[PDB]
Amino acid sequence: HMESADLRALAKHLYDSYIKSFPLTKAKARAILTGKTKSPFVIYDMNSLMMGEDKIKFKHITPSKEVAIRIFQGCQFRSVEAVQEITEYAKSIPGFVNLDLNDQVTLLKYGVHEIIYTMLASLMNKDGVLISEGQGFMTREFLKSLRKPFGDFMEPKFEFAVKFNALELDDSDLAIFIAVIILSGDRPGLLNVKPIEDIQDNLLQALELQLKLNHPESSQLFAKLLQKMTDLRQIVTEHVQLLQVIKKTETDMSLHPLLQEIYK
Amino acid sequence: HMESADLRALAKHLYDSYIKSFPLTKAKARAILTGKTTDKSPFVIYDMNSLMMGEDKIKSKEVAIRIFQGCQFRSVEAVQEITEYAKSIPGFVNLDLNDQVTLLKYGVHEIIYTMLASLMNKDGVLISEGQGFMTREFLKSLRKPFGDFMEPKFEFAVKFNALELDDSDLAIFIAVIILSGDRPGLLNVKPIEDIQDNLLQALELQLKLNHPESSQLFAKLLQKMTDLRQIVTEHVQLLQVIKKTETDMSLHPLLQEIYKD
């Protein structure tokens, strides 16, 4: 199908583009989280949150007065930013911009949720999550302690991330894996599935070789990573069901109509 | 890590046990569905009266209920066949007893829909050990919530069947599903994942030898476990609607235990 040297070329192409499109790489985030590097400002309670916004000025925690909502909303602000970074990255995947324009939009629409969850694990450990390009760190305990349903909104993301991180993928692995997710030929409404699965076949070959060369001791890591695509689809659907319960319950949630449109 | 000849021995073992455990194979089912055989033609059920004639030929309540009850009777039989097969998977019966139960609890339904695809084409499904064939249209036309019970299984089967797996492939794939270390409540994840590693190596080699032109079939088959998980969840939500609506309607004790939690 594809020759080994071409698969290495595709892997390197995707890695180079992944570094340019995403500001905070997994390699950099792990340096911050482990204490192996300007320590980030830590948000662990209500007062430290108040000081963090006053001193660091986090752009997702600014002008809807209740903290739990403010944080919940802040997460959606960052997610919308991440969609644009993922969209730019996808343009670098060989073949993608040659696809039918509606199919490109469909692949991004249904794939960004899975990729956001995947890449959020890079920024997490069992104790919290990096924010604002790594300058802040919000503790798991503070997040889980948010009232009513907002506390239980955050914890599932940590539970997935802890399991996903046990695979010990690095950025060069993740760049191919993210590409594989985007090129899923089973998204609803696709007009021309054939070139999408043709590209995914190439990407899967490149991921397989990448994993054997970069983790030669990690038996069947390729298979195990593919099994995580089950966890991703399952958690996205759960996430959707969680929002719908918020939307139908919480009357303090309204933003400026123009803001509501941006985050539709 | 395992040797090539050891992986071929494991595939042959599993295929052998699969033939012993499941009376209606994919190979037999396809001979029935494709026809050109006067000794294996099924009686076709497409409406009430042909169902009426079916009782006499294949051998007191509402039709949609009788059909539903029939599936649960067959589901219990399938759980029995699947449990027999699992005991033959090297290492399974050596596991902690609670884990054996847990793997079966969460695995039997994913396997049932996998092997049900073998009995399906786009127009209907074989029943009663291949003697009957019930049309998709007739099933979809059942009243209440029962009409929508089967259609998602058909939608999966049509896609899954496009992979063109045979029984020797499916024997390893089914084993991989059972030995899933991510089932909730498992006590000893590590020995389960050691077994699945061997099974995954064996499935990979099997697919390369038996489908050499079918690029990345291994990867594409594993992505199908996502479709399986979704169908189980849909089915469970349908049962709960039934439990709260049909209060004269009982489930088999074996089935009730599987669906608890």
Ligand SMILES: O=C(O)c1ccc(-c2nn(S(=O)(=O)c3ccccc3C(F)(F)F)c3ccc(Cl)cc23)c(OCc2ccccc2)c1
């Ligand atoms: O930098 C990043 O790469 C980054 C990306 C995403 C998120 C985040 N998004 N969301 S989300 O809005 O629910 C959402 C929306 C659409 C689709 C998926 C999701 C989601 F999968 F993740 F669940 C979150 C919910 C909980 C948590 Cl802990 C994180 C997120 C992110 O959070 C950083 C953050 C944390 C606290 C306060 C402010 C910012 C960072």
